[PDB]
């Protein structure tokens, strides 16, 4: 529970030409930067994606969940990004049948009980449909503003 | 090729002290979870307690009947874990099992702080407490 | 304790067999089922949602309802006759493990 650092250069919109690796690139990247993460968190970003998918077929545009062990992690962190188009996410659940995503929730938490808490908020914020549907629209200074005000009350 | 080895077990009057050691090779013994269980002759297992990794935080749960009385700490520099059995009573005469602790958490269907299950078990020592 | 199971379930050899295990934490937690041999340590069977270590027969299955867990074995063969025990959270919110009584397996083998 040691706080969720969030910063503002810590939210961007990515262009259309991204895979799945482009994503965790350009996610990861500012965490690397202020030495929140290992320097080769991607890589173990990236080998916990194919081993255990975060896709999630919520309503109405799919997300996806990157994260990895906390022993990666010196300091609790997240990173947001904004799809052009619909990327491929494999299934979390086990269904064969991929998920479109746009909005990508990257977690970097360092032990796990920080990992069950904030996994476990993350699936009451999904089900915010109306929060879903605002969430492609608003630009990369405003996201940080609705999205970093439910990492402040976290700290209940 | 994971092994788990426990030693120190023996007779101990009531109200005596023991020190169990556990011996851990083939795996990362810093980063992963362990957990003391232990087993009465002809009963079932009891959980006595666990301690987390360093990274973790290192915290230390242990059963109600075992509270204040045993203790577990690790040393991570020679990949041994230790459960510092103090105020023994008849009740903890057993075979003591050190097992390796997983976590686990589901995301769609899961409450924090998540399920605690043990992958690899020692094969164990036997304490007895007897006047 | 907490979590109770039936003290002993028999089955016939290449048949299938349920042992459940009742609590009222199973409704917010997972429970793990450990096989224990005669003068063997137990060994880990099924975790999670339906979890099965490597090396583990794919006949070994678990699963959940309401306030029970269930581990199934599909055909059951003269190796798996042991004692079974489940293993999840003492209440709702803890970070406290607890057993259940165990199951005497018999295979009529």
């Known amino acids: 529970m040691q706080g969720i650092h969030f910063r503002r250069h810590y939210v961007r919109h990515l262009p259309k030409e991204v895979s799945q690796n482009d994503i965790i690139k350009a996610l990861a990247s500012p965490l690397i930067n202020d030495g929140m993460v290992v320097s080769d968190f991607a890589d173990h970003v990236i080998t916990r994606e194919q081993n255990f998918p975060t896709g999630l077929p919520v309503e109405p545009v799919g997300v996806a969940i990157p994260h990895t062990d906390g022993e990666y992690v010196r300091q609790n962190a997240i990173s947001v990004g904004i799809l052009a188009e619909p990327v491929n996410f494999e299934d979390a659940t086990g269904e064969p049948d991929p998920v479109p995503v746009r909005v990508v929730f990257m977690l970097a938490l360092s032990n796990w009980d920080d990992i069950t808490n904030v996994l476990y908020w993350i699936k009451a914020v999904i089900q915010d449909e109306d929060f879903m549907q605002q969430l492609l629209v608003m630009n990369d200074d405003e996201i940080y503003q609705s999205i970093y005000t439910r990492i402040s009350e976290l700290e209940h | 090729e994971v092994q788990l080895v426990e030693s120190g077990g023996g007779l101990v009057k009531p109200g005596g002290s023991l020190r169990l050691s556990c011996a851990a090779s083939?795996?990362?013994?810093?980063?992963?979870?362990m957990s003391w269980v232990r087993q009465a002759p002809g009963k079932g297992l009891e959980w006595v307690g666990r301690?987390?990794?360093?990274?973790?935080?290192?915290?230390?749960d242990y059963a109600a009947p075992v509270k204040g009385r045993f203790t577990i700490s690790r040393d991570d520099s020679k990949n041994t874990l230790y459960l510092q059995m103090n105020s023994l009573k008849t009740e903890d005469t057993a075979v003591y099992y050190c097992a390796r602790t997983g976590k686990y958490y589901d995301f769609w269907s899961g409450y924090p702080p998540g399920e605690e299950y043990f992958q690899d078990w020692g094969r164990g020592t036997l304490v007895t407490v007897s006047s | 304790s907490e979590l109770t199971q039936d003290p002993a379930v028999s089955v016939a050899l290449g048949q299938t067999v349920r042992i459940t295990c009742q609590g009222d934490?199973?409704?917010?937690?997972?429970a793990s089922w450990y096989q224990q041999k005669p003068g063997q340590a137990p060994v880990l069977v099924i975790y999670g949602k339906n979890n099965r270590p490597s090396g583990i027969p794919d006949r070994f299955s678990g699963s959940s309802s309401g306030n029970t867990a269930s581990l199934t074995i599909t055909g059951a063969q003269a190796e798996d006759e042991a004692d079974y025990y489940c293993?999840?959270?003492?209440?709702?919110?803890?970070?406290?493990?607890?057993f259940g009584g165990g199951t005497k397996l018999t295979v009529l083998s």
């Open positions: 293993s999840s959270r003492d209440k709702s919110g803890s970070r406290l493990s607890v």
């Open positions: 934490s199973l409704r917010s937690y997972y």
């Open positions: 301690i987390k990794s360093k990274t973790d935080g290192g915290t230390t």
């Open positions: 083939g795996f990362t013994f810093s980063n992963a979870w």
